[PDB]
Design a protein around this ligand. Sequence first.
Ligand SMILES: CCCCCCCCCCCCCCCCCC(=O)OC[C@H](COP(=O)([O-])OCC[N+](C)(C)C)OC(=O)CCCCCCCCCCCCCCCCC
Ligand SMILES: CCCCCCCCCCCCCCCCCC(=O)OC[C@H](COP(=O)(O)OCCN)OC(=O)CCCCCCCCCCCCCCCCC
Ligand SMILES: CCCCCCCCCCCCCCCCCC(=O)OC[C@H](COP(=O)(O)OCCN)OC(=O)CCCCCCCCCCCCCCCCC
Ligand SMILES: CCCCCCCCCCCCCCCCCC(=O)OC[C@H](COP(=O)(O)OCCN)OC(=O)CCCCCCCCCCCCCCCCC
Ligand SMILES: CCCCCCCCCCCCCCCCCC(=O)OC[C@H](COP(=O)(O)OCCN)OC(=O)CCCCCCCCCCCCCCCCC
Ligand SMILES: CCCCCCCCCCCCCCCCCC(=O)OC[C@H](COP(=O)(O)OCCN)OC(=O)CCCCCCCCCCCCCCCCC
Ligand SMILES: CCCCCCCCCCC1=C(C)C(=O)C(OC)=C(OC)C1=O
Lengths: 314, 98, 347, 169, 57, 105, 70, 96, 110, 80
Amino acid sequence: MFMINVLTLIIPILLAVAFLTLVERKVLGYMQFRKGPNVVGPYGLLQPIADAIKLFIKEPLRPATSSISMFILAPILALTLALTMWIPLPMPYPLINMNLGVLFMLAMSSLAVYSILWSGWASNSKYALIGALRAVAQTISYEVTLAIILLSVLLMNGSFTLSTLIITQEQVWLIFPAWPLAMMWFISTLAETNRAPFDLTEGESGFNVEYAAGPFALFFMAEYANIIMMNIFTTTLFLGAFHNPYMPELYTINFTIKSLLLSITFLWIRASYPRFRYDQLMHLLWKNFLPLTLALCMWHVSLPILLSSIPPQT
Amino acid sequence: MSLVYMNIMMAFTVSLTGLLMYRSHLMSSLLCLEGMMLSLFILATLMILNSHFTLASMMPIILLVFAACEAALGLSLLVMVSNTYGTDYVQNLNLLQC
Amino acid sequence: MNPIILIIILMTVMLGTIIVMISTHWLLIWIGFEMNMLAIIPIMMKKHNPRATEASTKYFLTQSTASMLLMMAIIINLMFSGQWTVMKLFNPMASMLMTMALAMKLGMAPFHFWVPEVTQGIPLSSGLILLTWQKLAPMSVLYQILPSINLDLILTLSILSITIGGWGGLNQTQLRKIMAYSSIAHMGWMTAVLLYNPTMTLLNLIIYIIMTSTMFTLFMANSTTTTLSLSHTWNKAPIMTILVLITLLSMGGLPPLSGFMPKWMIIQEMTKNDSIILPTLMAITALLNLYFYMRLTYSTALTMFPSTNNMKMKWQFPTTKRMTLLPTMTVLSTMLLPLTPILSILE
Amino acid sequence: MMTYIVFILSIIFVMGFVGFSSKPSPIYGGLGLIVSGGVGCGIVLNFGGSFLGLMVFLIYLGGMMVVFGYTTAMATEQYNKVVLGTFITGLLMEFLMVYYVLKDKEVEIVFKFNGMGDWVIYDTGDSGFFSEEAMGIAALYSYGTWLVIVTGWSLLIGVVVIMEITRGN
Amino acid sequence: PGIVELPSLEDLKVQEVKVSSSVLKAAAHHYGAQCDKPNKEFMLCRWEEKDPRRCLE
Amino acid sequence: PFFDVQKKLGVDLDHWMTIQSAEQPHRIPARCHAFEKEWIECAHGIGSIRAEKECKIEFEDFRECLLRQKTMKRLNAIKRQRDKLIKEGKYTPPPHHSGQEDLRP
Amino acid sequence: MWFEVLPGIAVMGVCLFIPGMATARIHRFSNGGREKRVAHYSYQWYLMERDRRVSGVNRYYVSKGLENID
Amino acid sequence: SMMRWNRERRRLQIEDFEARIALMPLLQAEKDRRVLQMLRENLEEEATIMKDVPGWKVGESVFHTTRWVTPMMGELYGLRTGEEILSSTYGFIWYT
Amino acid sequence: MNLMITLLTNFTLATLLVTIAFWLPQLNVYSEKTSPDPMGSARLPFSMKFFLVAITFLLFDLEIALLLPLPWASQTTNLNTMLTMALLLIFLLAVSLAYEWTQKGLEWTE
Amino acid sequence: VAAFLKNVWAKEPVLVASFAIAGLAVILPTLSPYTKYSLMINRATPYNYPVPLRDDGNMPDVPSHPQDPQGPSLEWLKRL
Ligand SMILES: CCCCCCCCCCCCCCCCCC(=O)OC[C@H](COP(=O)([O-])OCC[N+](C)(C)C)OC(=O)CCCCCCCCCCCCCCCCC
Ligand SMILES: CCCCCCCCCCCCCCCCCC(=O)OC[C@H](COP(=O)(O)OCCN)OC(=O)CCCCCCCCCCCCCCCCC
Ligand SMILES: CCCCCCCCCCCCCCCCCC(=O)OC[C@H](COP(=O)(O)OCCN)OC(=O)CCCCCCCCCCCCCCCCC
Ligand SMILES: CCCCCCCCCCCCCCCCCC(=O)OC[C@H](COP(=O)(O)OCCN)OC(=O)CCCCCCCCCCCCCCCCC
Ligand SMILES: CCCCCCCCCCCCCCCCCC(=O)OC[C@H](COP(=O)(O)OCCN)OC(=O)CCCCCCCCCCCCCCCCC
Ligand SMILES: CCCCCCCCCCCCCCCCCC(=O)OC[C@H](COP(=O)(O)OCCN)OC(=O)CCCCCCCCCCCCCCCCC
Ligand SMILES: CCCCCCCCCCC1=C(C)C(=O)C(OC)=C(OC)C1=O
């Protein structure tokens, strides 16, 4: 019965990632004064299916790899981590209810740079390796503000428990006491997933260009699973919905609408801005987000003490 | 005593003898050094969690942090060696025989 | 280096050694050694040449291995004793691992193989820190765990250090390697009397630090790193030849000098414990140390090697180097033997 | 068999060390140390060290081995018998250890080790409404003042040290 | 050393409180109010004797 | 040189993590709190040389609490004899050691 | 016009609605019509194992009330 | 809003902790009778198993002290089934 | 236990999709390809700056590891000491960032 | 002291906000009247069992029952 619950988690993940590609092409279409796909299916609803079947019978690109083993391991690690980030998510009840789910997600997202690094070294292109090193340095840079912002928010929660974060936000959204943390958090999640305006793997080579159409599609769907997941996590973390315990589907509808709007906000940010130069988002992290993040971490340490608003441990 | 301590001590001795028998790379030496640290972390952790000695639960984190700073310093030394010879080969570090 | 950064880093070296000296918890012992190593690495890379990076790499690897063996000894002590007090150890395996780790930190033979390399690779001031200040923290830990140290191990390390530091310095012409093999022999002398009377261990450490600080200060004041450049000192500064003469005759332990003071006291404590063969063989082995000291005094003070012509330019310039405590350290390292019963202040 | 599970993880742990101690290449050795860190984390987690295991992931693996693999990928330009012989030597010594301590329920390499499953050494009570390990790590700010001072000072000095030695001036 | 002294299985027979934890938690404040005295006699005896065998009755 | 700065100045830098029987957060006892308290109160002040031979019983009880070597040896002996008698068929386990007894509370 | 993107958003929103609805109905099916017992702390697990022992059917969620006493 | 609600949450935490406190004597009495039940069963089966063994004191304490020692996990569940062992020794750790 | 089942299911589905993506188009018989990069064959030049930003990550990640028990440490009864040491750790992370600034460590990847 | 402040707020508003929020976090808990209640609430939270005292006969401040008047109260927490 638990295996049914695991499958009803992870097969809808793959379906939502499949149709997120359609939603991105359509929304980026209408924001660019054109249409998106509307020929292949009715309203383009068969475009992800057609594209999956196209990519899974395309010729293998057949690279000469420096390592065969890490070239196999990098998509496996990417998909495994992108599927295990979902299991503590309280929506309203997590699959795995763990006491330290926030730190679990921070750890499993910190492990996601090995897929980039191993795929960059497993290619024989030196320029692909340079791009992989830039992508890893970007991701580990923004993980610093992820961890410190996330700590500063959970100083209002009381624990690392993700389900407690719903109880924390029953009277007000947590974006009201922590909107500067929310906006630096949101741009840091935008820079974690290598999402525009932080997508330098498409700014003028990607780390995974030596993969065939199948494995590059697996990297791509792990990336969009990370995108939907971080939007759900940001929704749980700052926009926590009403939860009637006798009617859990009210919370499920509410966090689903908010997470969809936040994923469309990712789609709407990539339809609006040019890219950063690489040093410019390094400047954005180290010289702008990190001093404010340390200052607000001092503020959110000292603030529950000075107002007598320390959250409970349990 | 307990059976898991046998494996964690044997892991420390395996990472010891790897760290005490260099092949060519200094990076492989640093990896053996950090394997020694990791086995120390695991062994300290299993003792302190077993004994329910509460105040030493902050002890392995400390054992992590310093030693990882140590690892950082080691990486920096390797890079300086790599910025002299192009490789981190330990046979290039032989100028101090005379 | 920025002088502020130099001051903060040297205060951090001193802070690490003081944290080793004052702490009652083994984790803070390990932390003091980690802080000491981490802060002394930039002192060794002060001039930024490949020999300093090689020396700092070798120093890092040996001290890191000793720190891991130290933490394993600590963790086995926590196994077999359930506590953390910096005192005797409660397992002979943890005692052996801690004695090995401290022998690696001191560079006692057969873990001596980094000491003449690293001291050669680094400047004279950082070599002075490595051969004087870096002994204090492991000798403090050996001072506090001596109810658990194996006698056979500590005396094996002692005699192997004295013999290898005797034979190693006989083949050298570089002054820093001479001071390094002198270091190995003197650490053998300090650990040979540790389980018998550790006050004499502290006495030997203090007299050794004074004499080594005098010789490194003379080498810094004359800017000499080789034997053959030290032999140009009589034509540049004739008083420095007298000072290196009396200090090298002191370091060999010739009476009536003060460097005769420790080893004699060490023999004075090893014959009370019915060991006659061991301090006799130690004293006969120290004649090798005295032999290459006499080689340096023949090169520098008692003869006059030929100089060059450009020396005549250096006659027109006095030494502007801050020869810090050099008359004080020269007087203390030579004329202190009539005050030998002052050693009771170390009890 | 499932009562021995931590022991089983520890076997894999030792196997993982014979992965990188034999030193095939620093990148495969990095991978072996990553797998070793994951299974040693599982060993930690199965005694109740949830926070310490997530420190193994976030700080050892996701923090430090990232920098090891990152620095390693900037060296050892991309494309043995001693490695293979060392690996089979370590594996056969470890399986002889397993065979002895399972056939005898006791072994002595240096110390005497029981051969029962390591579930037997646990406590039979509850800790109430707290993890004891979580409260002992929370005591770093209330009881660990000197430890916080010396650790934060060593990290600040470590920043200064890396910036001094990586400059070359 | 010595032989451990355990009470018999007859000394451990008692009519159990066979209710679930929500029954106990829902009645918990009135249980602490009403059953104060034998509970605190038991827990004083339990922290003073440091032995459950001495605290059975 | 053990320059005892902590006792001189009266500060407490690291004595708190030193033993298991010290003041713990939320009064959490160690599993060998009583044995370690008895060994420390035995061996206090009399010096290590007398403490090795005069407090051997408390220290052996405390070490056998810490590592449980005699206890696990006894469990080895009982389980091995039980498995031998099951192999010989001269013993049968009771229902409460087979899981058919409807547990106590 | 712009509402042409709403079928894909509807499909993706149903696909995000499925996991939480599924785990809520599976938790109510597996735990006697109620929520899954959250045992983050060892006291909660102690109460839960006590419920499993006092139920008599080796199921923690089968609750026994005042009818189980005299 | 977080001030008012976290103060309410602290009061609710104190109410839960006092429910726990009011229940702890009953749970402690049941726990004592539980562990003495299990030790008496282990002692009786040790008595009926360890008869052939020469020089075996049944129920011999491995401690020199006569003080009560908290019963270890393998002392209680040593003679029982593997499912009861795993449920008592990794049940809370593996619980989701 | 349910966590290990879920990890095994996620890893097995990932390995199955990777096996399908590496072996479903291998069944075709397309054509053999002879096929004889911005840098041609020049060895990868080392960047000091990427290593410095990775080490700065590592050191700030250790300082983060120290900062992680604060939502538990706020529950203590020695709150003045706890608040002082929390502000001191975040201040030492800020001093590390300031020294990384002022010695031009955050330059050309600012 | 005022031209420099407007200068740095014109050039570097991120850093002015950073140092200002950090200064408030430093100085404001010492000026707050509610810092005392944080301590009082953390000591009012009963993690452990209230191990009772043996009645020697002369303890007028220790109650015999939870509903007795003497003992520590939490009226301040319910009211605030
Ligand atoms: C979670 C739900 C959503 C959250 C909100 C986010 C929605 C909006 C997103 C819009 C699209 C953004 C795309 C990427 C943008 C990247 C560029 C960018 O913005 O860079 C950040 C820019 C960078 O600025 P810059 O780089 O342009 O500025 C120049 C800087 N120098 C001089 C160094 C070159 O700003 C920041 O870094 C600010 C981050 C947020 C700060 C929040 C401060 C709150 C107020 C604090 C108090 C202030 C008063 C003082 C104290 C008073 C006390 C009483
Ligand atoms: C959680 C919800 C998830 C939902 C995911 C799916 C979203 C999109 C749903 C489908 C949208 C409509 C699909 C219509 C497909 C095209 C049908 C069609 O007209 O096909 C015509 C083609 C040729 O027809 P022919 O007879 O030759 O025409 C001449 C007539 N004189 O005939 C053919 O091509 C043959 C018939 C092909 C039919 C394909 C149907 C679509 C497959 C969809 C798969 C997913 C279904 C839903 C799964 C989840 C719910 C169970
Ligand atoms: C035993 C018998 C079966 C043997 C094995 C076959 C299995 C079933 C395969 C699907 C059905 C077979 C027929 C496939 C389509 C054939 C008809 C066709 O091509 O119709 C064309 C029609 C659109 O007309 P078009 O030519 O595009 O005109 C442009 C508009 N002016 O096209 C349409 O209207 C839409 C056609 C959609 C095709 C079907 C839907 C996609 C496939 C779904 C199942 C497989 C993938 C599942 C999900 C994968 C992961 C996302
Ligand atoms: C290259 C190799 C292959 C790469 C792809 C696959 C690996 C990478 C992706 C998967 C990562 C696995 C992570 C496993 C541990 C995660 C941490 C964890 O267990 O946290 C959850 C929870 C802690 O929370 P808490 O509620 O306190 O505990 C339960 C108490 N009621 O604790 C629990 O719930 C405890 C549950 C029991 C213990 C679980 C032990 C898991 C098995 C060992 C580690 C497996 C991974 C090894 C390899 C790592 C990556 C190389
Ligand atoms: C039980 C005992 C407990 C502990 C008691 C105390 C032990 C003290 C141990 C002393 C160790 C001294 C270590 C070396 C000094 C440290 C500072 C330093 O680095 O000084 C050298 C400094 C560098 O200047 P720089 O410009 O780099 O010189 C090279 C040329 N350009 O400047 C120079 O180069 C200037 C040249 C002269 C420097 C002389 C320094 C002598 C210091 C030692 C004095 C003797 C020991 C104290 C008295 C006995 C105590 C036991
Ligand atoms: C006391 C409370 C705790 C304080 C410590 C904790 C702070 C939390 C935030 C952490 C910040 C870490 C990094 C700080 C680095 C500061 C140095 C610096 O950045 O100097 C360079 C900068 C000019 O920038 P530049 O070098 O040109 O770089 C290119 C961008 N233009 O130069 C400048 O921009 C000048 C910066 C200094 C002036 C800032 C003034 C702000 C005043 C706010 C009101 C007072 C608040 C109370 C605190 C006292 C502040 C002095
Ligand atoms: C298990 C496989 C499920 C289906 C595959 C993922 C869903 C389809 C995505 C198709 C796709 C789109 C639209 C796409 O635009 C794109 O280019 C950026 C891809 O990467 C190569 C894609 O993979």
